[PDB]
Design a binder for this molecule. Structure first.
Ligand SMILES: CCCCCCCCCCCCCCCCCCCC(=O)O[C@H](COC(=O)CCCCCCCCCCCCCC)COP(=O)(O)OCCN
Ligand SMILES: CCCCCCCCCCCCCCCCCCCC(=O)O[C@H](COC(=O)CCCCCCCCCCCCCC)COP(=O)(O)OCCN
Ligand SMILES: CCCCCCCCCCCCCCCCCCCC(=O)O[C@H](COC(=O)CCCCCCCCCCCCCC)COP(=O)(O)OCCN
Ligand SMILES: CCCCCCCCCCCCCCCCCCCC(=O)O[C@H](COC(=O)CCCCCCCCCCCCCC)COP(=O)(O)OCCN
Ligand code: HEM
Ligand SMILES: CCCCCCCCCCCCO[C@@H]1O[C@H](CO)[C@@H](O[C@H]2O[C@H](CO)[C@@H](O)[C@H](O)[C@H]2O)[C@H](O)[C@H]1O
Ligand SMILES: CCCCCCCCCCCCO[C@@H]1O[C@H](CO)[C@@H](O[C@H]2O[C@H](CO)[C@@H](O)[C@H](O)[C@H]2O)[C@H](O)[C@H]1O
Length: 589
């Protein structure tokens, strides 16, 4: 005897993914080390090395993600993540969106999109001092994700019915990694002492990151109204408005970046806003719609904010700059009030607060958005071209045009604000196209105008739906109450339908002539979760309107109903569509 008998360890998805996250951690660790030596002692052979490791770090990250997709497709049940997330396992589209379903797979997809964005920024045309430092901080973020994926929270150990629970996560993860690369440049810029050049080289990641943020927030609104179906587009609970804080700051930052992009002004506020917006997007992406991983993310957040504002610490009035800076102050003040209100029950040792703070601040940004671009750059005082009458005229028109109907001073003043805003969009377009010719060539101005108008339409829609909504909860056998809000319904039974994993039950209703005839709102005894009854609502859109139909409890042989009535919520989503087809127009169609 005495001749050894070797075996392989057979190549699982498990050890492919383990070599994936470990090899990615190794590549990103030595990328952070070679980038830091490249800044400190100034040698070119280390800025070559950190730029050499961007492609292998992303490749090992892709190996780990494709190992998780591999395991989810081959129906290996030995790993903990797949055995706990193939308790919703069968269809093809949900097996490909299970690799970010719970926590560990989602931080794998998060670190993957980080590595992809670092790869796409690694071919930078950037001078080597802050090239070494952007690689240092971006490899640090990758090292945090794969460290927090490797020592804690590993995917490779041993629920619903809608697709937006797939695509609302990635929309923010993309958004975060977009706001990664300006922040990197900023923490580079304040250390490389070149304070203006950083934001005009990084501008498209800032716009695209904010576009992914705005599509995420509007998509979460639509999904919470129509598919999660608790009769509302917005929640002020500490999970939901925590994805409202980053979107606010990434908006203020977008406007300040544009100012210095065109003027070299507020580089101080730009550094502040990209640091605050980036760490905000971190803590918003960690705590979206869903132990000791929270401590690691809290330490990472503290590190990010402390680093950016520490390096900023070591380093006109009535104009378009003043209007944009006051608007960015309004955005930052709004995020400040939402954070200061969220922790105001925490730090002592509701929805009326947030609504009553949001309506004046929303009125202020909807006013400033109209008045700002109609101002010239760096003016002393508003004495010459006071065009502000006709805007005020439109403003005044809308208020009386609403006040001479039912509309309360909130709703009628919001009508005045939208009419003032469409007036400003026309005044901007008229004073733009008068140069004579295709104004559509100037993609920033015309796409921004479409985007500005789209928010204008949402301010009207939100104030009209917030003011004018009625809910009624009834219980009908073949009727108890029939007319609510313009159409009379009646009860016609329950059906049972089996489509799968969930059994569905029905309330079939009836309406006359052009009232929506025979509708069918839904309910699930959904077997997978602790036998709960969640609803999915049915809703007719109308020419002025949206009508939401709810089940509440379907009882044993008689059932209940809820019907809520809101105005202009469909026009809120046509405004969301207008924002999508405008921010795409800032890019190339
Ligand atoms: C010019 C600017 C350039 C700057 C670029 C540099 C960037 C560097 C990268 C930044 C990363 C920041 C990471 C800070 C987070 C640390 C937070 C610690 C978390 C923690 O202690 O968790 C506890 C222990 O868990 C545990 O059991 C241990 C968990 C440890 C997780 C750590 C994850 C590793 C992340 C990699 C960090 C980077 C390393 C540096 C190369 C909780 O549990 P408990 O004990 O309280 O339970 C209670 C029972 N009593
Ligand atoms: C319903 C599902 C929802 C899924 C949403 C998917 C989003 C659609 C993606 C469309 C684009 C995909 C194909 C185009 C490939 C383009 C890659 C290069 C992009 C690029 O070069 O842009 C740089 C910026 O990068 C950037 O700003 C970031 C580029 C990243 C593109 C978006 C990545 C999406 C990844 C999602 C994968 C899952 C989809 C699988 C079906 C330019 O910068 P610059 O240097 O020129 O600026 C200089 C300033 N002076
Ligand atoms: C699946 C759901 C996703 C919905 C998206 C709907 C539209 C899908 C297709 C988008 C195609 C847009 C054009 C893609 C071109 C990719 C090729 C790269 C070309 C390139 O590098 O040019 C850049 C354009 O930005 C870019 O690279 C554009 C990247 C494309 C992603 C942009 C979408 C994010 C914003 C819209 C939000 C809606 C998302 C809804 C989920 C920079 O320009 P430059 O070099 O000329 O700069 C200097 C001037 N000074
Ligand atoms: C200088 C030369 C002289 C010119 C003259 C100067 C005149 C200045 C005029 C400017 C005055 C600004 C006044 C703004 C008041 C807010 C009106 C809208 C409020 C509203 O929505 O209706 C409320 C009820 O809505 C509700 O119950 C829930 C509302 C939820 C908040 C609404 C969110 C709106 C956000 C809009 C989004 C904008 C786009 C964001 C990107 C009314 O109820 P109330 O009377 O009880 O209120 C009392 C709070 N103290
Ligand atoms: C605080 C009030 C606001 C003011 C004064 C304002 C002003 C401006 C200005 C001057 C521009 C440059 C193009 C132009 O001159 O039209 C611009 C661009 C833009 N704005 Fe606004 N804005 C405001 C609020 C908002 C809001 C609420 C949104 C969100 C819908 C928004 C989204 C955008 C976008 C996406 C661009 C294009 C930026 C680019 O990629 O170049 N702004 N804004
Ligand atoms: C482009 C992005 C811009 C986004 C702008 C949005 C900022 C302002 C947010 C306004 C919306 C807040 O609206 C919020 O809606 C929810 C859900 O409908 C309301 O919640 C409501 O739901 C229940 C449902 O039973 C009702 O019985 C109850 O009377 C009421 O509280 C909140 O009380 C209100 O605060
Ligand atoms: C010198 C003053 C200058 C300001 C000019 C104001 C113009 C005058 C506008 C008054 C017209 C509004 O008239 C009003 O209309 C509708 C029609 O049913 C009803 O509507 C009323 O209901 C609600 C009840 O909460 C009020 O909040 C609302 O503001 C009001 O419009 C009132 O019964 C009637 O008083």
């Amino acid at each position: 005897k005495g001749a050894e008998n070797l075996y392989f360890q057979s190549m699982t998805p498990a050890l492919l993914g383990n070599l994936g996250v470990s090899l990615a951690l190794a590549f990103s660790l030595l990328g952070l080390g070679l980038a830091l030596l490249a800044y400190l002692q100034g040698d070119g052979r280390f800025l070559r090395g950190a730029r050499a490791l961007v492609f292998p770090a992303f490749l090992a990250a892709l190996a780990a993600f494709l190992a998780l997709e591999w395991a989810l497709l081959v129906h290996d049940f030995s790993l903990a993540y797949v055995a706990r997330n193939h308790s919703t396992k069968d269809p093809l589209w949900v097996t490909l969106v299970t690799p970010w379903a719970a926590l560990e797979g989602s931080i794998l997809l998060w670190g993957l999109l980080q590595t992809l964005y670092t790869l796409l920024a690694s071919r930078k045309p950037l001078d080597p001092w802050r090239a070494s430092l952007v690689l240092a901080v971006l490899f640090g973020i990758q090292v945090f994700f794969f460290g927090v994926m490797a020592t804690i929270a590993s995917p490779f150990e041993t629920l619903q019915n809608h697709w937006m629970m797939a695509v609302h996560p990635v929309l923010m993860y993309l958004g975060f990694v977009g706001l990664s690369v300006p922040y990197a440049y900023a923490v580079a810029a304040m250390a490389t002492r070149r304070y203006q050049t950083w934001v005009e080289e990084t501008r498209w990641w800032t716009l695209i990151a904010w576009g992914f943020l705005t599509a995420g927030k509007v998509a979460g609104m639509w999904w919470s109204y129509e598919v999660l179906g608790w009769g509302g587009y917005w929640a002020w609970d500490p999970v939901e408005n925590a994805s409202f804080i980053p979107w606010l700051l990434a908006t203020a930052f977008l406007h300040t970046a544009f100012v210095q992009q065109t003027r070299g002004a507020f580089k101080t506020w730009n550094f502040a806003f990209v640091t605050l917006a980036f760490a905000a997007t971190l803590l918003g992406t960690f705590l979206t719609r869903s132990g000791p991983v929270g401590p690691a993310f809290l330490g990472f957040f503290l590190f990010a904010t402390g680093l950016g504002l520490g390096l900023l610490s070591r380093v006109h009035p009535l104009s378009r700059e003043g209007a944009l800076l006051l608007g960015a102050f309004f955005f930052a003040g709004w995020a400040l009030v939402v954070v200061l209100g969220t922790f105001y029950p925490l730090l002592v040792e509701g929805a009326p607060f947030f609504n009553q703070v949001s309506a004046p601040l929303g009125a202020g940004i909807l006013l400033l958005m109209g008045v700002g671009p109609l101002l010239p750059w760096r003016r002393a005082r508003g004495e010459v071209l006071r065009n502000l009458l006709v805007l005020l005229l439109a403003l005044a028109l809308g208020t009386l045009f609403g006040l001479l109907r039912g509309y309360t001073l909130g709703a009628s003043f919001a009508l005045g604000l939208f009419l003032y805003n469409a007036a400003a969009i026309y005044l901007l377009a008229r004073e733009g196209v008068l140069a004579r010719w295709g104004f559509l060539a100037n993609r920033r101005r015309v796409g921004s105008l479409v985007v500005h108008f789209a928010v204008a339409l949402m301010g009207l829609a939100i104030a009209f739906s917030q003011t004018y909504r009625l809910e009624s909860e009834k219980t009908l056998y073949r009727g108890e109450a029939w007319e609510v809000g313009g159409v009379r319904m009646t009860f016609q039974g329950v059906r049972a339908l089996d489509e799968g994993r969930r059994f569905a039950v029905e309330a079939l209703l009836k309406t006359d002539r052009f009232g929506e005839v025979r509708p069918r709102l839904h309910f699930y005894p959904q077997m997978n979760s602790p036998l709960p009854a969640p609803k999915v609502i049915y809703t007719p859109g109308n020419d002025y309107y949206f009508l939401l139909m709810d089940f509440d409890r379907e009882k044993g042989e008689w059932a209940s109903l809820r019907l809520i009535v809101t105005p202009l919520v469909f026009w809120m989503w046509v405004a969301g569509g207008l924002m999508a087809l405008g921010t795409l127009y800032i890019l190339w169609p």
